[model samples]
Target: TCPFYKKIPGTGFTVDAFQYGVVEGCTAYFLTHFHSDHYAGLSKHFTFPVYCSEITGNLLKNKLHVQEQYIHPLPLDTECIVNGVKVVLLDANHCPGAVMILFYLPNGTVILHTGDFRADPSMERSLLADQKVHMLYLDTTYCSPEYTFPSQQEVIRFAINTAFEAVTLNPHALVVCGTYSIGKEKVFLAIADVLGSKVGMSQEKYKTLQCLNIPEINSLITTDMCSSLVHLLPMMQINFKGLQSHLKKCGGKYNQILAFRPTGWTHSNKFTRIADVIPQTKGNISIYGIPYSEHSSYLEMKRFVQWLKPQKIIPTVNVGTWKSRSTMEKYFREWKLEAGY
Candidate 1:
């Protein structure tokens, strides 16, 4: 009901743990993932018991030093009762521990909170078939037809191949990748394994990756630049603005740098969209934004809404003039009529 944390009607539970003024005095909370935006205001001093995936729980303990007693792990597809409400966690396939929380209210109402996910056909069959979602909290990050893009797996393969191709063209060059704090680990890991080069990340990222317990990534993570030709830096750090300072630090370390970012925004400028790599060169650094997104695109969102057939759709993000409640609702209506599903 609030802009920060939503309170389930008549239920004491809250979603997405926001800690600001006069919030939902929640009896319990649900954390969809460990991403900073979704996990806003969470700190080591948190008091509410959080229900999330095992990986997110481990990250909370290892990264934030949150006590295990306050963190509750909701295994995938398992149902657990919290405050008299039945909750099921499904694999969101967004990040390492991201999940879609399904709440089955006592009144037989079903609310689906798709916490930052890319829609997959298999997910519909496995989780959404036969379930009539009464309400849906949708991830409307790319809710326009101009935002149509490729799948995560296709982009992952593209990134890995691009990185190898960059290295092959210039053996002395440092191939860099732009990635978020949590998601896109697979891209970097694949690049490392394929190119026979260890992946290096910032100290903070290295710690975050450790929580996933992937020995391959843990064994290769290093602060030492010479340890690997392929580098994994924060998504923003690989851009042109970040490269200005990034170069001042490692300009002489390599012959050249080619960085690529996997995102849906850069897929195309016009409405007719196709999935391919877009590269922009600034001096010696060539930056590319691949179409790899964790959120549903316009086409996917339409299909997801059609399949779910929720009576109401609420967008998770509520900032910016483009994302106003009125604008989002208009898009939803237009999409439904145009899609005819």
Candidate 2:
């Protein structure tokens, strides 16, 4: 588990530890992504040099107003020396600019810190598959067996198909999908493309998406509410009351509303089938809790750990308490033994 201080051992560096204040030995700081939790303590007043992917760098500058001199944007899949240690960045497959950082220490130790990621199959074919990692800082958000939900692709397909069906049945219904500040753009993008519907969003969110440089995003987004029936809203605004007020504010442009809340919290082992993932309904609004998580599932984490076979495993999430950390360690031990280590 990540220590309370959040410093990487055997190196003068910290990964996502800005919130902990400056440590004596640490010379550089590394950010895995632009998520609020990972980049919590960053601000304009920060004095240390920070390194991250190019997209993340752009976001920090544009969104957070961080200075460019302190932001070092490294290109993907390339090795660069920072201070005395060699570092590489790889796509995390979780968010637009998120990365799994690999650090090579002077003492011949290799450490991999996966900030927050989805263990996609493409990661198995990376150069990391051939090299032996000494220490691994894993994202254990779903470390338990109960979180084995469907893949992102499967859930995405389900969302698109489901939205299409709903819209077909009631052409006058408004379609709104929940999203975070940086992630889940793919969900609404796919829906809009397949359904041939333009998406409505605030100018601020549109600007954030522009920083991601997704070419197709500009054509589909609009600030004019009357221009489109499909809207992109924050996750908090996808509830029954929220949708009701939103519909009423729109002045009866649409009679019914279909809202999709995409997150992993909706899934559980109790579900018998994918179709059984139910929806909450009241009056003219229906909310579907789509299991579209960016974090890897428990089975995916197990596969990742077994394949990597790192000598030391440290979980990043759910480590606030001893009981949680110990449970994760138990799973790590079992995975290591099953891998014939």
Candidate 3:
């Protein structure tokens, strides 16, 4: 329920625990990504040394206005010593600046804190290798059998195809892709590329994209809404009323609206085909709740745990209650038993 698990037992380091205020013995803080939930307590007034990826460092300075002197941006895949502990950052595959933090303590204890990641097959070769991890702080966002969904590529293709079909049927349709401030760029970018249309977003969001340093993004996005049929909006603004109001504000530039609300919360075990997850349509607006998640699925989490076989497992999510934590522990024990650990 609290940020208690964010504190490393013996080390004076904390991962994504600024919300609880500064810890007494903590000397350095580690931020996995720029997500609101992860960086809840951080602000301009925050006074602490922070270690994170270079892209994340830019976000803190640009978005949050955090001081540059206190922000220490580390290079990915390279080990750097901070406060006598060897720390390495690896691609998290969640957000653009997100990373999985690996800490090698002075006492020979190897701790892996997967801030928020989608378990990829490439991680087995690039990250796993022969290093024995002593402790693992897992994402555990979808840590149950019922939370299984299709792979990220599969979901992206589904979204692209769905948007294509809608546009083919009606060329005047304005496709709006819902997204967070930093994540899910692949989905919308693919949609725009496949449809051969420019992406429309707020000027503020365009500045955020600049922080990612994607060379092609500047040409792909436009602040002028009238120049593009496809627009990027916050997830909250993808509803029926929101879409209706937006379409109305368009002043008849578009006849119909096709919205994509991409998130894992809409998925379930009973869904067999991607098409089975129906879209909510009313009049000229249609909202498809696509199961596009940044976190690992239950099966992926199982495979990750089995491969690593960490001696101690600490879940980062679903730890708000004892029942939820115990349920995740059951799955952890079962996977460990199957791995013969």
Candidate 4:
């Protein structure tokens, strides 16, 4: 379905002081990144001006291999005015192509929308510097403390010290996990770092590696790259199963493989039910599990609301329940905080 925010004949509803991303005389929509959730309709029949960053455009063309051409590229780390609204793109820290939008309205209101980003301490300073933000469209995905995850570096450490060690032990293991194509560049960087000096990444992922401009962290501190590393990698167009078989050949030498997926890999309808099963004959698996995630933890959401001192804080995602609804309604029904200046 489509949502129209245009000023139609109001059904006697209140129109408070406002402006949304939509504007008259222009079809405007911004794709946060090439992630399935955000850009699902991109390059399909629905054609409005889909705006994205320069790297995203290249990814859609090269990485995504989509032929449709309405995709527009915004300059990195620069403010650009399209139609009428001004948009400033900041590093989302989720991936190379992903961005956290700081939209500036003519009315002087600043809105912060973090699509799906870890509460990276590195970005905290830049975020606080954006003190004048009037409203923050926060990510509530994992806002609770119980679900909050460790830092990216920490997760990388887990993969390196544990997972990749298994790979090193068994040269031909096929590992599988999920991550967003453009959104999880950091994971790839970390993985590539683990595989450094020995092997190199294929041109597809290596290009994304180049976009990451962190000076000191450029060279990955690993032995080399793996041909197996090429398959589990998404966002690149290539032979999928063929990659698996090739890696399987190196099983004893490489031990296990590393695979990343946004969702699990059980959905694939294998040639047979047994084919999907992890073969009993495959060399002993270490089953490396890492502590990693990207989302707003519950405590962080509450904490963020506290910092903003907004009149009201709303939990906009899945957690609100019937029992909790009453509690949330009483607290969120209005924009008012008890502490006053």
Reference-based lDDT, each prediction = 0.76, 0.84, 0.87, 0.49
Better of 1 and 2 by lDDT: 2
Residue 222 of model 1 has an lDDT of: 76
* Pairs that clash in candidate 1: none
What TM value does model 2 have?
Answer: 0.95
Off by over 4 Å in 4: 3-26, 44-46, 63-69, 121-124, 127-131, 163-180, 185-192, 195-283, 300-305, 308-341
TM-scores, each model vs. reference = 0.87, 0.95, 0.96, 0.63
Residue 55 displacement in candidate 2 (angstroms) = 0.7
Query: What digit string (tens of lDDT, one per residue) describes model 2 on residues 1-341?
Result: 34543677777888887777776777888998888888988888888899999999989899888999999999998889998888889999888999998888888889899889999778988868768899898899999888877767788888889889988998888899988768888888888887887788888887788789677666888787688878988889999888988998888679998898877655453465566676799988999888777898888889888888899887778988999989998999888878897
Clashes of 4: 41
Count of steric clashes across candidates, in order: 0, 0, 0, 41
Q: Candidate 2's error at 101, in angstroms? A: 0.6
Candidate 1, residues 1-341, lDDT tens digits: the string is: 35542666657777775555336467887888888876777778887788889999999899888888899897788778888888888888788899988888888989888888888777887666757888888887777667766666777777777778888887777878777678877766787788887787777877788888565564666767667877877776887778766666665767677787766576364543334446798787788766667777778878778777778787886445764767778988886677664
Put the candidates in TM-score order, highest first.
3, 2, 1, 4
Q: Across residues 1-113, which tens digit of lDDT does each residue of candidate 3 receive?
A: 33667887668999997787768789999999999989998889888999999999999999999999999999998879999888889999898999998988878999999
Model 1 clashes, total count: 0
Q: Mind giving the per-residue lDDT tens digits that candidate 4 earns over 1-341? A: 12232111211110110123233444556666656655554443444565677767676666545554666788766778876667777776565567766666676766665655545545556644665666555555553334544455655665555446656776555454343354444554565556543224446555654544445544442223443342333422123453345455555455444554332112232232321223222233322223444554444545545555543233433444675545544543332344331
Best-to-worst order by lDDT is 3, 2, 1, 4
Worst 10 residues of 2 by lDDT: 265-274
- Which residue runs does candidate 1 get wrong by more than 4 Å? 21-24, 213-215, 239-253, 267-278, 318-323, 334-341
Looking at model 4, report the run of 10 residues with the lowest lDDT sum.
8-17
Find the candidate with the highest TM-score and give its number.
Answer: 3
**Candidate 2 stretches greater than 4 Å from native:** 1-5, 267-269
Residue 221 in candidate 1 has what lDDT? 69
TM-score quality measure for candidate 1? 0.87
